Design a protein around this ligand. Sequence first.
Ligand SMILES: Fc1cccc(Cc2c[nH]c3ncc(-c4cnn(C5CCNCC5)c4)cc23)c1
Length: 279
Amino acid sequence: LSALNPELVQAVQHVVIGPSSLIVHFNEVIGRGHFGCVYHGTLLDNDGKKIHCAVKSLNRITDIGEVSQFLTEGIIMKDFSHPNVLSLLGICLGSPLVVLPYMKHGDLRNFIRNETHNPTVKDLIGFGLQVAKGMKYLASKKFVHRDLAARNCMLDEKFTVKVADFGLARDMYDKEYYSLPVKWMALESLQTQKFTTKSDVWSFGVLLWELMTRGAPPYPDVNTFDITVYLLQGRRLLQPEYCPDPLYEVMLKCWHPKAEMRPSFSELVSRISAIFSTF
Ligand SMILES: Fc1cccc(Cc2c[nH]c3ncc(-c4cnn(C5CCNCC5)c4)cc23)c1
């Protein structure tokens, strides 16, 4: 730790959580191992208020070169703050730690799939509008997500959706064993391996479809290899049973073959809030 550049150490100070500010409960995992080694933690603020948090041990980082790089992704993610984006509470310098807020209802996909939960069409559209608000913010900062899907959004105790699985919160589903999300990808990303805000808009379209079907898998009868030819033929996901026609018009616009013809996230927020307001 002494070996790190002093000007870089000074730069990351605002992101660092001191060991006397955090109680990590290494004896209790969050979400029955489905999110890897994520533990409950208690973070103390400047006034001593207790904050329930989720603590991820970043096992991939070993050498000083990697520590220095992760320190930069921390500085960048710390500047990202919005009600519909998962915030980075801080980092701890064994393994470096990533401290994230605790999300009572886990991931959005599992929540909408759970038989015991009964969100209305309005509630589902509200979740979609929340995701659109989070993405409008990321897009405003020229940040391209590359893996937007319902499994990658989280829900807190107030049912606020937080876009996640980006920056230091990426590989959210990395499970350890002892022995590309092509169905959410824009046609041009499948052909070029390049990603833009316009390819996030296509992905948002599929997540909208996921919300309106209460988490059904997209294109269940189509192989990942066959998705390109299927999309090139002009075939698209069909209108869900309980989905308003203007909302399906929105989804279809997200899947337009010409990237420039797709709505921006600011247009999606405008259009979806107008639809939400009719309920
Ligand atoms: F972008 C990320 C990067 C790394 C990790 C993570 C995961 C993560 C962060 N904060 C969390 N806070 C709570 C839960 C969680 C899991 N399951 N549950 C409930 C669900 C209802 N049943 C009881 C358990 C709550 C998971 C997380 C995200």
